Amino acid sequence: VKCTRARRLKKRSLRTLWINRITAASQEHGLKYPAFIINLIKCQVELNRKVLADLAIYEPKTFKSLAALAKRRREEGFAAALGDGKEPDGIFSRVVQHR
Amino acid sequence: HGKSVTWWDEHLSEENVPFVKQLVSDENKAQLASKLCPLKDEPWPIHPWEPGSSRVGLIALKLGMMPLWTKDGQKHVVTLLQVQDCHVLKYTPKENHNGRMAALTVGGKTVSHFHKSASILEFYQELGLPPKQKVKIFNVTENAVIKPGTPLYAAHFRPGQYVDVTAKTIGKGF
Amino acid sequence: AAPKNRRSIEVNRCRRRNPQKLIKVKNNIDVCPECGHLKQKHILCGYCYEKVRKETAEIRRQMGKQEGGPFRAPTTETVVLYSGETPSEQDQGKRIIERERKRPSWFTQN
Amino acid sequence: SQLSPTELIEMQNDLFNKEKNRQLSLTPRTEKIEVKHVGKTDPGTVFVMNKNISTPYSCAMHLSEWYCRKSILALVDGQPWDMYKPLTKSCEIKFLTFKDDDPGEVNKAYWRSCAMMMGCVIERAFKDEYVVSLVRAPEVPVIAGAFCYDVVLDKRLDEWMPTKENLHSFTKDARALIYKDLPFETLEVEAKVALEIFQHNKYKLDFIEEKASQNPERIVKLHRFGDFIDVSEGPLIPRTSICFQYEVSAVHNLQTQSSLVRRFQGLSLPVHLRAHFTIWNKLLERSRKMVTEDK
Amino acid sequence: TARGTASRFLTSVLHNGLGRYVQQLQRLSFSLSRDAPSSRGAREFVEREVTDFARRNPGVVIYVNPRPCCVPRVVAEYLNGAVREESIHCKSVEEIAALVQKLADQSGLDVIRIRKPFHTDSPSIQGQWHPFTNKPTTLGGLRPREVQ
Amino acid sequence: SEKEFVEHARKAGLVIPHERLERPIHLACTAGIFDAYVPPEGDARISSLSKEGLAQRAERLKKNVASQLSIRKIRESDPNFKIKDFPEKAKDIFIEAHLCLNNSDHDRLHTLVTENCFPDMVWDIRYKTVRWSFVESLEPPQVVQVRCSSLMNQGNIYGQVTVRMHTRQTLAIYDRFGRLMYGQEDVPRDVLEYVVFEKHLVDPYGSWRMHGKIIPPWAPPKQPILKTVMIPGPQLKPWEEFEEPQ
Amino acid sequence: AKKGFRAAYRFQKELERWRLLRCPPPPVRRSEKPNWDYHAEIQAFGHRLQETFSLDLLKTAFVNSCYIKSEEAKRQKLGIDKEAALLNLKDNQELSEQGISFSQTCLTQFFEDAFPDLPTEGVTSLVDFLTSEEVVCHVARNLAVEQLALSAEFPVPPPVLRQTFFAVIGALLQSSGPERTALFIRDFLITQMTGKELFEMWTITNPMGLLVEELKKRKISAPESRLTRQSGSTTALPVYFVGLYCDRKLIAEGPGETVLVAEEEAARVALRKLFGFTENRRPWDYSKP
Amino acid sequence: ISRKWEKKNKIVYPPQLPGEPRRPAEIYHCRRQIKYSKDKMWYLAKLIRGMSIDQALAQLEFSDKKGAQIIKEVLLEAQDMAVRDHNVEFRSNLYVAESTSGRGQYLKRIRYHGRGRFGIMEKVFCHYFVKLVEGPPPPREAPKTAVAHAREYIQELRNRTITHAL
Amino acid sequence: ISHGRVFRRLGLGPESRIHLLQNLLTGLVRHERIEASWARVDELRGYAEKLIDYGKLGDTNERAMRMADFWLTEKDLIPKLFQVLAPRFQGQNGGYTRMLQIPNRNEQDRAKMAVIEYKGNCLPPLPLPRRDSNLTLLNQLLQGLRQDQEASS
Ligand SMILES: [Mg+2]
Numbered sequence A: 001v002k003c004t005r006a007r008r009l010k011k012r013s014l015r016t017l018w019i020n021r022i023t024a025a026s027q028e029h030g031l032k033y034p035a036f037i038i039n040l041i042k043c044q045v046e047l048n049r050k051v052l053a054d055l056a057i058y059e060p061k062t063f064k065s066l067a068a069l070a071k072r073r074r075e076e077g078f079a080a081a082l083g084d085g086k087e088p089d090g091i092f093s094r095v096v097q098h099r
Numbered sequence B: 001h002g003k004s005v006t007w008w009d010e011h012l013s014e015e016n017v018p019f020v021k022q023l024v025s026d027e028n029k030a031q032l033a034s035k036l037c038p039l040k041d042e043p044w045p046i047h048p049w050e051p052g053s054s055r056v057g058l059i060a061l062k063l064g065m066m067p068l069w070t071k072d073g074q075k076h077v078v079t080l081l082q083v084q085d086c087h088v089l090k091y092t093p094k095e096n097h098n099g100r101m102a103a104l105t106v107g108g109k110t111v112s113h114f115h116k117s118a119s120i121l122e123f124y125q126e127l128g129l130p131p132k133q134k135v136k137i138f139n140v141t142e143n144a145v146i147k148p149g150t151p152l153y154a155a156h157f158r159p160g161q162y163v164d165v166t167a168k169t170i171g172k173g174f
Numbered sequence C: 001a002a003p004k005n006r007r008s009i010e011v012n013r014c015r016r017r018n019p020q021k022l023i024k025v026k027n028n029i030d031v032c033p034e035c036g037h038l039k040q041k042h043i044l045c046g047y048c049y050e051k052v053r054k055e056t057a058e059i060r061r062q063m064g065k066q067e068g069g070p071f072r073a074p075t076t077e078t079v080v081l082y083s084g085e086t087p088s089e090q091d092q093g094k095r096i097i098e099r100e101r102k103r104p105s106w107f108t109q110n
Numbered sequence D: 001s002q003l004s005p006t007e008l009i010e011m012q013n014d015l016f017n018k019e020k021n022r023q024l025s026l027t028p029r030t031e032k033i034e035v036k037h038v039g040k041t042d043p044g045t046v047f048v049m050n051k052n053i054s055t056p057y058s059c060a061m062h063l064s065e066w067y068c069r070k071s072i073l074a075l076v077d078g079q080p081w082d083m084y085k086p087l088t089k090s091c092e093i094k095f096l097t098f099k100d101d102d103p104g105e106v107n108k109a110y111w112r113s114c115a116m117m118m119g120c121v122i123e124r125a126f127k128d129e130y131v132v133s134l135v136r137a138p139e140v141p142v143i144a145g146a147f148c149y150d151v152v153l154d155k156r157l158d159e160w161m162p163t164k165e166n167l168h169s170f171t172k173d174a175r176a177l178i179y180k181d182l183p184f185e186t187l188e189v190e191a192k193v194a195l196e197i198f199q200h201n202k203y204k205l206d207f208i209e210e211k212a213s214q215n216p217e218r219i220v221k222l223h224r225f226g227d228f229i230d231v232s233e234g235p236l237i238p239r240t241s242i243c244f245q246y247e248v249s250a251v252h253n254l255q256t257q258s259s260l261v262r263r264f265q266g267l268s269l270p271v272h273l274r275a276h277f278t279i280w281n282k283l284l285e286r287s288r289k290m291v292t293e294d295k
Numbered sequence E: 001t002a003r004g005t006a007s008r009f010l011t012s013v014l015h016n017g018l019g020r021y022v023q024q025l026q027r028l029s030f031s032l033s034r035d036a037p038s039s040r041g042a043r044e045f046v047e048r049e050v051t052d053f054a055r056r057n058p059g060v061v062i063y064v065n066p067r068p069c070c071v072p073r074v075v076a077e078y079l080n081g082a083v084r085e086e087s088i089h090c091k092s093v094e095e096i097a098a099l100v101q102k103l104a105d106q107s108g109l110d111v112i113r114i115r116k117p118f119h120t121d122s123p124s125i126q127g128q129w130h131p132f133t134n135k136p137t138t139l140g141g142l143r144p145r146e147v148q
Numbered sequence F: 001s002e003k004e005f006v007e008h009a010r011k012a013g014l015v016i017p018h019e020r021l022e023r024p025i026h027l028a029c030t031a032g033i034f035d036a037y038v039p040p041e042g043d044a045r046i047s048s049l050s051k052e053g054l055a056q057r058a059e060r061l062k063k064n065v066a067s068q069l070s071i072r073k074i075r076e077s078d079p080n081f082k083i084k085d086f087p088e089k090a091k092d093i094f095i096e097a098h099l100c101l102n103n104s105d106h107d108r109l110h111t112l113v114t115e116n117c118f119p120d121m122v123w124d125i126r127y128k129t130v131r132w133s134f135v136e137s138l139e140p141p142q143v144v145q146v147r148c149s150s151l152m153n154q155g156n157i158y159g160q161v162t163v164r165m166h167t168r169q170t171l172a173i174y175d176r177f178g179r180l181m182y183g184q185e186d187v188p189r190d191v192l193e194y195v196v197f198e199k200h201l202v203d204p205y206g207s208w209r210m211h212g213k214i215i216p217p218w219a220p221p222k223q224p225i226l227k228t229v230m231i232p233g234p235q236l237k238p239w240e241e242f243e244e245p246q
Numbered sequence G: 001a002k003k004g005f006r007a008a009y010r011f012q013k014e015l016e017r018w019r020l021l022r023c024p025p026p027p028v029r030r031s032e033k034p035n036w037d038y039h040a041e042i043q044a045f046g047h048r049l050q051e052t053f054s055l056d057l058l059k060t061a062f063v064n065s066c067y068i069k070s071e072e073a074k075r076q077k078l079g080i081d082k083e084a085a086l087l088n089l090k091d092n093q094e095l096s097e098q099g100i101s102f103s104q105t106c107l108t109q110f111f112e113d114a115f116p117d118l119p120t121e122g123v124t125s126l127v128d129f130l131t132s133e134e135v136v137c138h139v140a141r142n143l144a145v146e147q148l149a150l151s152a153e154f155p156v157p158p159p160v161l162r163q164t165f166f167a168v169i170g171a172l173l174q175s176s177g178p179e180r181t182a183l184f185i186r187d188f189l190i191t192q193m194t195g196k197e198l199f200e201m202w203t204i205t206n207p208m209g210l211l212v213e214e215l216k217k218r219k220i221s222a223p224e225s226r227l228t229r230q231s232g233s234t235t236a237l238p239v240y241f242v243g244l245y246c247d248r249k250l251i252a253e254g255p256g257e258t259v260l261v262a263e264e265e266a267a268r269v270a271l272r273k274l275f276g277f278t279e280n281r282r283p284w285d286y287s288k289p
Numbered sequence H: 001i002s003r004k005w006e007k008k009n010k011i012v013y014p015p016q017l018p019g020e021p022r023r024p025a026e027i028y029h030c031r032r033q034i035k036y037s038k039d040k041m042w043y044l045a046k047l048i049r050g051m052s053i054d055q056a057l058a059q060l061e062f063s064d065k066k067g068a069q070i071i072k073e074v075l076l077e078a079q080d081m082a083v084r085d086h087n088v089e090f091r092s093n094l095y096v097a098e099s100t101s102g103r104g105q106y107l108k109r110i111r112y113h114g115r116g117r118f119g120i121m122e123k124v125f126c127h128y129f130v131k132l133v134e135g136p137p138p139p140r141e142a143p144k145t146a147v148a149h150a151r152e153y154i155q156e157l158r159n160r161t162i163t164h165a166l
Numbered sequence I: 001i002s003h004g005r006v007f008r009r010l011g012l013g014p015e016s017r018i019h020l021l022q023n024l025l026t027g028l029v030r031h032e033r034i035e036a037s038w039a040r041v042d043e044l045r046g047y048a049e050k051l052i053d054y055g056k057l058g059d060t061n062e063r064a065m066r067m068a069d070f071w072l073t074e075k076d077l078i079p080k081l082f083q084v085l086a087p088r089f090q091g092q093n094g095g096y097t098r099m100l101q102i103p104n105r106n107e108q109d110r111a112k113m114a115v116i117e118y119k120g121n122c123l124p125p126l127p128l129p130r131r132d133s134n135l136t137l138l139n140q141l142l143q144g145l146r147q148d149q150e151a152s153s
């Protein structure tokens, strides 16, 4: 019974571990986890937490590039919100539809 | 290597036991007599008394109890504390001991060499005195320090004074 | 009071294999210089004491057979002599027991 | 002669092993000897031992482990006999311990063993650049406070004397040598091979010649433990670990007409007779003094 | 139970599939009976489609033994020396074919708990994280409270 | 509450059960060698030269009236028996029995040697390893004498033939732990023995079986063992004093 | 008494299992095992590797000298005549030596083509590692060369395993083309370098000396060791990062528990970068040319 | 019942080829159905484990237990058999490799209590097994030193891997 | 709390202890050497010494005669006490008895046993523990130290 319950809980435990590692790496790059995730999503980068943690551990340059992209998207979003102008559009704020 | 137990009389002969006994007795007598003049060899500097000064103590022997009478007619009972052989063994600096007072180690009556450990015997050999039974530590001020090896006498206290007496009480078991 | 639960084998082993309950080794065992048998340093040798006790038993048997009563305690000194021996000038005036055995090596003439 | 001390030790060990192999090969067959035991403890025992292979230590092993632990020397019917020397013919054996009625021979054997250990530590505790040559081990009586070893140092070492730290380091090395069990094995060799085995120490060769002069067969005894080889008179203790208390007491220089010799004096007591701390200190103070016993 | 049984990491035999793919099934030995009712499926398999399997897989030696046995068995020996013994007792021809194809497809490694669903050698391209991989350097390499 | 132990192994045979056996014991041999051969004092210096040994051995065999009547009795009890080819058969039986003891073949050993020979060669060797080989035979075995004993209580006649054999083996007896105990395997030591064979002439089958092994009292002592032996003195009670023999 | 035979048979199987677990029998040859057919095994060995061998060449390559000597001893012990056919057994000595030579040459060519900066000593070390005892024995065991190898002492000592494997290589070289044999070598020996480092198989002694010699060859004066980063120095488990600077330009950096170890690791990293055996280097090309 | 300690002494090894080190002799002996108690005899068996036979006899001679004499007799019998049957010289060159005590067959009796009650009194019997090996006793294991402890700690620190990472 | 107690409790009380002690003393006086439990012999040693002192006190002394009459249960030993034991203990002061521990009893009780013996009796001497001879290594070193001390004195 414990084997089945822990089989169910293993996915949650591993997801929590990956989230903790992503928080660690992002804070090491001067960024918070919620901001990093939401801006990576807004950049249409659909990398899950397992891949993100793998990149954080083994691909530090790639993770720093992703963090820079997330921070840039956050800055563009803040600028758009402050301006409230439709005609200024961010370079990384453009949405690409299915082709 | 199954080493067997041993003592000092195990291997000695019927004629060497008195010789060893008298040799150790003569050595102890010479060592005790060497320290009877502590103020002429190299005494430590003597400082003036201060209001917050603390003195060293003694290690005496509780002989017995005696009646005593006062000029007003009252009768008290006194305890006899005999200072048999009280010596200063080692000195410990204030910052290295407590940070408030220095520590003076004082040793009491003499015991046999043949029933002490190697470290204790070596310490007393470096010091230059026969081994003592009881060893205590006294918290004194830096101006009341005394050179180790100095003897102490019952004249350290004077008639009319109050003292603190520390000892292990009579054990009554379980 | 009755035990609430059965004590397990792990607890039992931890209790009855403790060094307090184990048998201590003795380091005061030496060989007797006379007969070569083992003995303790503070205890007389068993072999030698058995020899002396047996010889004393034989001597006592002889000196009790010499006396016809239970209350015949000698009022003088006593000397034991072996075959091929005669009382000396100092042993005269005492009581003498004679043994057919030769004088043992350990029994000093004195 | 350009020869490293390690190379000299190795070649000495090689020649000793060659001589021992020759001695063993001298007897091709295995003869049986009947050795009686004349001890007071267990009399009437008979051992059927092997000729030139079995040892009084093997006899002690047959008897009991107590015999192996206690028996220091052996009396093969006419003389002291160290435990690790193979027996030659049918005989009778009496084992001797330290606490015997007449332990003089055992005391002498322990005394030479301690002197030879001190000689070894003197030889191996000096600088390689400096010349160190052991002369002999004087036969000073046990009543003297210390056992002595005679050595000769390099000329440029004639101005300095060992200090407390050097003596304590020598004691450390001696105790390290004690810690490892190094049996004392003996060999009856001739002068013709003693000359070639030593071949370097003029004083040692003079000692060997003096020893072989009184022998009609020119037979000398060579004793060795570990990698150290030396010549000494009489038997030795079986094992090094017998020495429990060991100290290098002092060094004294004696200047003669020909050359000066350093007498290294040391003190030691076995496991079976270890003394108290104060008694040991008194004996060490005794041993610090000068002892002069040559003839 | 993972804690009760053994485990191993994901691996391939002799780097299989890297330069070329080598089938790991070395030999396949069928032991059946010519008259036992429980061996009917094995008999039909041997009659119909053992030859087709042999032609499809030329790298495996197939032995067939009709002997008086009560339970029919198949023994698959792999290049590792691993032996897998299965019972084809009272099974249809399709079940025999599926089991034989599964044995041929398997790599012969122990079927136990696999610790990770992946295995790569040197996964630390462009570096691996260490606490100094993202910390700026100061002039002279001075400590926080060190005065030069 | 009163259960007790059982199976106390005791051996106590009395004269009544030792004499109440209905059927008697049917022996296949005898207790020992009747009229035991006494070899002459000089054999070492006569084995060197063939003629001066063989001629005297044949003379001694032929001039003994007891041996002649014994061989006549054996021949009349069992035909097709000759003393000329007997040494070859005795040598073959000896070699086969020793090989059987080497290989631990108890059945064939019982067939070859008799009931007085099997124990002395198996009892103290069952827990060891033996590597016995035959290499050469310098002097062929020679029949020395023939003796016959007739017991009229059962009407049975036993005939034993003594054969002197000087030959070379290579013996190596190992321990139960696999280490050498007696001697090396490649040493071809020379041994002289007297093998005495016994046959039951009344028995219809009557196989020739080795019965005894006689060694001269003056034979050289066997090779020494590899290990050393302690022989303890008389154990003394406290009431006993050691006596030194001189 | 319980009536039944199934329980008794099952417990007999259990007893056999216990006996096998208690006293493991010495390993026996797969040929001595019942299901065996040498011709079918040879054909399957040829087929499963996708190579077209020659049957006679494979039979002559799988036979060893020890097997021939053992067969001769058995023949002389039995007392029959077998010189008519066993004399022409065609031992695999020449095939093995040809295979060894070709494998060494092919591996050397591969290494000099892939890593031009690797010195001759390094290339020879890599070739020796790839054709060494353990690698070749493992490859043969996993390729089932041991089962098909005709030799006494079924353990097949590692020299015999290497000889048989290289005899198979030589037989393939004689049957098919050198290009196909080179492809076989690449597929079954170079893959053993997967996941391995350079110095793991090279085992040099003075990395700093080798680096300074290589820099002298490449016209660089000398590398200067500088302590770049560190974390704890009075503790029992420090870490030090030591970098090597050539003309004040970083060329390598290495961590270690002590400064000397860190400097040696930095020298090894510089050597690997110079020789092209970086961990992020181009993976080996496994494609048909 | 089970009797295998007797049969463990009847195995025969093949002869050792030259160059192979000499195999030490192993001697198994045991005493069956001893009235003395199982745990009480285990105490003495543990006491005399791993030491030389002479030292074990020395301890058992002065031990006050009832089983000390039984164990001493068993050890003396084992020594005599090792000297006589097995090819073992130097009767003092044996050490006690194994020394165990097990339980045998018990006897059930009635222990009277009072108020008509009773208990099951059990008459205990034990077996003592000893195994002696020729050669000097193996050295006793020393306590782990600080250097060894630090080495193992550092090795376990270096054995770490980044779990659930790749 | 038994501080300052010199007599151990034996028997069924003080009277039983006295009776046991007097039985042991009578046996010791009769046989000149007895063996018993270590504690009982240790208790009896002092009474034996005091009895020898009372015997030395004199035959005509009424107090000593009555004490001997009480303590020696067998009345044939009082003449022995006053005419054998006391004459041979005249120059001595307190060394009348010798007490030595012997190995424990053979039966299951394993009691600690001692043997007590009047000195100078007509019995085989006990295996007394002898000290080492001066010829031993340590004793010879001590002898040499003593010789140098005497020379410097
Ligand atoms: Mg789910």
Ligand SMILES: [Mg+2]
Residues within 6 Å of the ligand: B171, B172, B173, I001, I002, I003
């Ligand atoms: Mg109290």
Ligand SMILES: [Mg+2]
Residues within 6 Å of the ligand: H116
């Ligand atoms: Mg009732």
Ligand SMILES: [Mg+2]
Residues within 6 Å of the ligand: H120, H122
């Ligand atoms: Mg119960």
Ligand SMILES: [Mg+2]
Residues within 6 Å of the ligand: none
């Ligand atoms: Mg119950």
Ligand SMILES: [Mg+2]
Residues within 6 Å of the ligand: I010, I011
């Ligand atoms: Mg009581």
Ligand SMILES: [Zn+2]
Residues within 6 Å of the ligand: C032, C033, C034, C035, C036, C037, C045, C046, C047, C048
């Ligand atoms: Zn004794």
